[PDB]
Design a protein around this ligand. Structure first.
Ligand SMILES: [Mg+2]
Ligand SMILES: [Mg+2]
Ligand SMILES: [Mg+2]
Ligand SMILES: [Mg+2]
Ligand SMILES: [Mg+2]
Ligand SMILES: [Mg+2]
Ligand SMILES: [Mg+2]
Ligand SMILES: [Mg+2]
Ligand SMILES: [Mg+2]
Ligand SMILES: [Mg+2]
Ligand SMILES: [Mg+2]
Ligand SMILES: [Mg+2]
Ligand SMILES: [Mg+2]
Lengths: 161, 141, 142, 6, 283, 48, 46, 53, 58, 74
RNA sequence: UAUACAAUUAUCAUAUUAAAUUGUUAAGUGUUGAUUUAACCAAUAAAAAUAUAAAUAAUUUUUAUUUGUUUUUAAACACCAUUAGGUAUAUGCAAAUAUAAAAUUAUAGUAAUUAUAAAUUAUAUUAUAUUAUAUUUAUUCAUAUAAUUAAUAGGAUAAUAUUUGUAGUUUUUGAUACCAUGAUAAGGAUUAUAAAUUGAAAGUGUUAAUAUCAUAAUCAAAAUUUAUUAUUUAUAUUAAAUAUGUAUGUGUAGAUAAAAUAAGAAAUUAAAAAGGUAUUGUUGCCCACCAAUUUUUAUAAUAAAAAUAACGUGCAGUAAUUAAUAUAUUUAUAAAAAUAUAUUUUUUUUUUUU
């Protein structure tokens, strides 16, 4: 039954939705659950409590620890919410955006070769329609200042060799 | 399941070698046996250390009082007759009856291999210093 | 079996190192039959009573042409020493012989006077591999 | 890896 | 290479021809493959889905006495609560398939109601007859949903249509009531459902569920309708469907309905599904 | 299958097959047998 | 098991899988409920 | 949480470092146990096993 | 449920198959036919359970 | 050489519409019925006299986004 | 033997309407020394930033002009060789993919083709769809022997059988010590808790069609070399089938074993993206040198090219054990390798002023 849907179930091999042909494997990384850059709920809390803990041992603060674990207690349902919404996104995306791995990759430079060609063409017509894909010869670190008069001190256009 | 590989031939002159080896193994075993029987009976006759543990009671008590009194005046001849081997010592203490029920329950005796040491033994190393060429089952001095 | 030391090596499987019910192993090989005991000398590997008669094999049961070896359970009798006759027992490789009579033998079985596992090891019956392994055990010199 | 063909 | 030589077996009083060719193969690279499946009368009549033909008197008699199949399916599912039977997922499947026999027809109609900005006035007999005819052609398979939809929007309405639409609509989105009352009306006057309400209810329900979806009334052109590649049945648009270490070796070990129950050759230690090994005490 | 034929009395796979009586059928006697009543054989011992 | 890593704990069926939910934990002290109810109502009136 | 009490905190790191040195021990990952490849057909993908350095 | 829910005296564990069968093939009697008419928790008698019957008797 | 996964079954992104376009079925069914040897489906009995709109063309053959292709969906 | 390219879009060598060319900046000394590298060895180390407008379109430049090779190291990096040095980047020469073409190879007579891209190929740290691997206890592991497998035959209390005592050698050959097909084991890796099992098909001596060396079988009392086995560790110790004499050494090397189930353990992780010159597919295929031969010729250390199935060296290629491809220069048992450029017919990892 998994033919004609060339994407298979979910959490499953070949379930991944595609965007301009390269599949989407970063979903969690988006909603900021489980990422190195991940969204952080409570900071001021833990820094406040750490501050207290480091200051002195005479007075003890459960006054902070309560604020903090109140915070975490909420954080749980917040996360289940975000995860839920994101699964909804995976579905919406699959319906209305993804091409199901049908269209050519856009994400590697050679896939844009035509574009680059357009600019090579330009640099050639500037050269009297001649040197295609040619570039100025690299010179030396000290190129300008080590060369005597009569020799080119700066790299020329390639047709101007 | 591999087909079993056939066993190689016996050897030559091995039948005489084996006959000889077993033969003189037995003629040796005769002096082994003789020596060990001497050692065993010699052990049986000679004196041993006291089989009871003086770290528990009714034994820890001063040798001028309690059990030892019962031992000095009433039991002495009997204990010296059996050379303090732990089996008849314990049995005599059973039969004297003035300790009566305690011999097994309350009282405590040295482990088998320690109680076997010769009279006048000083250091524990004496357990491993007994002759090893003799077959008495740890029953030799 | 790996090596066939007999007929049965063809028929039998070893089945690893396998446990048998107490005191029943299919092939009785008494490695312990000669196992020196001074104090236990009369009670060990011998008649459970001193009041029993000698076994069947201490007597000629019928008209015999004659025998090669007497069975190993035949007890050594004073006549075994005195008479000066061939006393043969089937051991390995071939046969053991009571040649040099002594009175220290009397009243024990030749099951007891014959060492089943000898310390003498022929290298002619061993594979090169086997010899290697016995060298591992620190039995054979090399 | 080199020998893999045997 | 010591190739295995299999002797062919000839048909026998108890070993008939087709049995031989099905259960025995002389090419021993084909041994130990897997199990093969076949069907006889009823499972074949289900699988092959050969639509019957109308015929002489018996077939018409059987059309007459037919009665309500939708209720029959339900009775037969329900009857699994009788003491002498079980509750069958197959009986339920047959139930389901008769409830949803039309299904996609409704789906099509949703699109005509909700997927089209300004489909004229849907009360007027003209556009109404367009809708009616196309619907009856989506049912009875005479047309593809795609073709019927593209027909519906390209159907002839009225001269200078857009310029008349500028006299009513700003951004060209009409009101959707006329459309739904129409699309329920068609299914009622066409005989589409056995029980009258079902038309209206399904059409309404399917809309109300989609109302909550992001960009609800637009659809990708390829997935909207029948096309080579499709969406998985949960994501289709107006659709009705919107130990642990030892478990692979366990398999059979739960409470398991079987097809062919295992046999002693093919399963070594399994005791049967009914068995309760750690029984509790009950009065 | 083998050189030793299955003895059909002991073997369930014979007994309970379609060509004999399975254990879930009702286990009664199939037909009566009068052998010794129909034709009777007079006694002649092989020993005098 | 054999020359392989032991599974993670959650890869096994539940340790207490055969012990009914009412048992873990036991709810005991049912005797005191009524007492603490009457107590709290009397309190309220005060 | 059973047994709550008001007692003061202790000093940070009251424990004296153990007699087994964890530092001089090298952490092993991939070759640690022995695995069996589920690879059905074809050359095993070189990027995973061998490719970097 | 794997098999119809009925008193297990109607079931026999099959030989060679892992499954059970009815020793009267295909027929079934409901629990109501095992006990006397209108038996509370179908029972030989309504007074007590098994253990209760036994120790009362004792 | 690596490709996007489903390219084998990738649809023709220009022409996949043609097959389903109403005019097509109008013409085909037109010369099918004409034979005398086919029974016209009823949709054809209907759109026979209300043939579909002329100048709506897809965005595939006409490459313009700004073209408002539809009198309806505009 | 003769017998009908394209002209709307075709990648290796016959270019052509074009604005360039020229710019004098930077960087350098305090002191007693393990920098760089997966790893060696020579031995001061810092550094070289600026330009737009403008040049008109086409019709006789094709012997003209033009497509990354460049003086000066007394300046370095870098690269090549290894402590000695070489070299260290557009003033000589140097047309050349950006496509005008007619099946592959081949200097334009050789072989009969070649080339090609989407099927298929298990591991690249994703959210707890709803709960835990970092705990416990273990590791001295041995046992087989003394040859004949070939058919029936009934008894006391029964109407009579010496059938008491039933007598016809000799033409066949496989399960054997021996080649002689089948078939059932072991092996935990994601269908979960409710009225419920923590053991699987992919085959472990004995089993049914290949015959053409031989009697090898326990009924006692017996000979250690075999990967695949939980033994009793200090108060008392051999009586019935005969029953194990050796190893006290700081609970001590390496390396190993078992378990989440009527027992008692609790928070760290795991699902989703991927290539094949093979084609039941890596035990897959291929690459060059290195012999014979065969055949055409435009004979360069040792001619060139094409067929080809030995021998020997390797392991060049299939993202393939330092990714490949093209040009360039160098290097060389042989595939090829080093460096300089371009490049993906190589696999991807992603800051819209922080
Ligand atoms: Mg590739
Ligand atoms: Mg693919
Ligand atoms: Mg050209
Ligand atoms: Mg087999
Ligand atoms: Mg020639
Ligand atoms: Mg040549
Ligand atoms: Mg290479
Ligand atoms: Mg290679
Ligand atoms: Mg390579
Ligand atoms: Mg190359
Ligand atoms: Mg080159
Ligand atoms: Mg080379
Ligand atoms: Mg090269």
């Amino acid at each position: 039954d998994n033919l004609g849907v060339r994407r298979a179930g979910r959490g499953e091999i070949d379930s991944s939705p595609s965007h301009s042909g390269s599949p989407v494997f970063t979903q969690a990384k988006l909603i900021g659950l489980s990422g190195e850059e991940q969204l952080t709920m409570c900071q001021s809390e833990t820094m406040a409590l750490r501050l207290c803990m480091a200051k002195a041992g005479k007075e003890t603060c459960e006054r902070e620890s309560r604020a903090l674990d109140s915070c975490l207690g909420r954080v749980g349902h917040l996360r289940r919410a975000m995860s839920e919404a994101c699964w909804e996104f995976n579905d919406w995306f699959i319906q209305n955006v993804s091409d199901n791995h049908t269209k050519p990759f856009q994400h590697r430079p050679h896939d844009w070769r035509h574009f680059y060609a357009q600019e090579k063409l330009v640099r050639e017509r500037q050269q009297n329609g001649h040197a295609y894909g040619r570039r100025p010869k690299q010179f030396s670190f000290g190129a300008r200042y080590v060369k005597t008069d009569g020799y080119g001190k700066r790299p020329r256009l390639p047709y101007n060799k | 399941w591999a087909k079993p590989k056939k066993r190689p031939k016996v050897g030559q002159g091995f039948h005489e070698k084996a006959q000889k080896w077993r033969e003189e193994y037995l003629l040796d075993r005769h002096r082994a046996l003789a020596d060990s029987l001497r050692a065993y009976v010699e052990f049986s006759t000679s004196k041993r250390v006291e089989p009871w543990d003086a770290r528990f009671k009714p034994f820890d008590r001063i040798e001028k009082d309690g059990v030892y009194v019962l031992m000095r005046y009433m039991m002495e001849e009997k204990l010296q007759l059996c050379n303090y081997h732990h089996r008849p010592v314990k049995r005599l203490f059973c039969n004297i009856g003035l300790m009566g029920p305690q011999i097994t329950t309350k009282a405590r005796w040295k482990p088998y291999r320690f109680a076997t040491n010769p009279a006048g033994t000083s250091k524990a190393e004496r357990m491993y210093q007994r002759d090893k060429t003799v077959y008495t089952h740890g029953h030799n001095d | 079996l790996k090596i066939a030391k007999s007929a049965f090596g063809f028929y039998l499987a070893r089945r690893g190192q396998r446990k048998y019910p107490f005191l029943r192993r299919p092939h009785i090989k008494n490695t312990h039959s000669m196992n020196p005991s001074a104090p236990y000398f009369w009670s060990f590997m011998t008649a459970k009573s001193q009041m029993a008669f000698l076994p069947e094999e201490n007597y000629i049961t019928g008209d015999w042409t004659g025998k090669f070896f007497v069975s190993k359970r035949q007890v050594y009798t004073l006549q075994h020493a005195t008479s000066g006759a061939k006393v043969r027992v089937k051991s390995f490789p071939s046969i053991f012989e009571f040649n040099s009579p002594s009175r220290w033998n009397i009243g024990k079985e030749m099951n007891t006077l014959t060492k089943p596992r000898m310390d003498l090891i022929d290298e002619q019956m061993l594979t090169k591999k086997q010899r290697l392994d016995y060298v591992r055990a620190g039995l054979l010199p090399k | 890896y080199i020998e893999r063909x045997k | 290479a010591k190739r295995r030589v299999i002797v062919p077996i000839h048909p026998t009083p108890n070993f008939p021809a087709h049995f031989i060719k099905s259960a025995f193969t002389t090419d021993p690279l084909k041994e130990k493959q897997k199990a093969r499946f076949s069907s006889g009368g009823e499972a074949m009549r289900e699988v092959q889905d050969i639509p019957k033909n109308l015929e002489g008197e018996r077939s018409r008699r059987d059309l007459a006495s037919r009665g309500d199949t939708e209720f029959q399916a339900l009775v037969e599912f329900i009857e699994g609560a009788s003491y002498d039977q079980l509750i069958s997922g197959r009986r339920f499947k047959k139930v389901y398939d008769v409830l949803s026999e039309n299904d996609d027809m409704f789906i099509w109609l949703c699109h005509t109601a909700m997927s089209v900005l300004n489909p004229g006035d849907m009360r007027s007999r003209l556009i109404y007859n367009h809708l009616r005819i196309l619907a009856e052609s989506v049912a009875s398979g005479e047309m593809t949903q795609r073709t019927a939809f593209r027909f519906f929007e390209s159907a002839v309405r009225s001269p200078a249509y857009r310029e008349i639409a500028k006299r009513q609509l700003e951004g060209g989105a009409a009101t959707r009531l006329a459309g739904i009352s129409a699309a329920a009306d068609v299914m009622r006057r066409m005989g589409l459902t056995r029980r009258p309400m079902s038309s209206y209810f399904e059409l309404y329900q399917r809309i109300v569920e989609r109302s909550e979806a992001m960009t609800p009334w637009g659809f990708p052109p390829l997935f909207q309708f029948e096309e080579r590649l499709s969406l998985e049945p949960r994501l289709k648009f107006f659709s009705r469907a919107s130990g642990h270490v030892m478990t692979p070796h366990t398999t059979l070990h739960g409470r398991r309905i079987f097809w062919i129950p295992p046999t002693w050759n093919r399963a070594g230690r399994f005791l049967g599904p009914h068995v309760t090994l750690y029984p509790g005490m009950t009065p | 299958v083998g050189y030793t034929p299955v003895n059909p009395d002991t073997s369930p796979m014979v007994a309970y097959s379609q060509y004999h009586w399975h254990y879930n059928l009702p286990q009664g006697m199939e037909r009566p047998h009068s052998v010794n009543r129909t034709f009777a054989a007079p006694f002649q011992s092989n020993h005098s | 098991r054999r020359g392989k890593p032991r599974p993670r704990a959650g890869m096994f069926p539940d340790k207490y899988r055969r012990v009914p939910m009412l048992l873990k934990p036991q709810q005991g002290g049912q005797q005191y409920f009524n007492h603490f109810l009457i107590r709290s109502t009397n309190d309220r009136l005060t | 949480i059973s047994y709550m009490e008001d007692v003061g905190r202790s000093v940070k790191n009251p424990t004296v470092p153990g007699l087994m040195s964890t530092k001089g021990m090298k952490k092993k990952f991939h070759n640690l146990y022995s695995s069996t490849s589920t690879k059905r057909m074809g050359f095993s993908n070189p990027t995973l096993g061998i490719k970097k350095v | 449920l794997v098999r119809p829910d009925v008193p297990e005296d109607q079931y026999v564990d099959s030989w060679y198959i892992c499954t059970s069968m009815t020793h009267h093939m295909g027929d079934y009697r409901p629990w109501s036919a095992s006990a006397p008419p209108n038996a509370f928790r179908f029972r030989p008698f309504n007074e007590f359970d098994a253990k209760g019957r036994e120790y009362v008797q004792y | 050489y690596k490709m996007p996964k489903n390219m084998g079954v990738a649809p023709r992104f220009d022409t996949w519409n043609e097959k389903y376009e109403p005019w097509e079925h109008m013409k085909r069914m037109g010369r099918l019925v004409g034979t005398g040897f086919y029974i016209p489906p009823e949709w054809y009995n209907h759109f026979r006299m209300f043939p579909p709109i002329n100048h709506n063309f897809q965005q595939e053959k006409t490459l313009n986004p700004h073209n408002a292709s539809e009198p309806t969906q505009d």
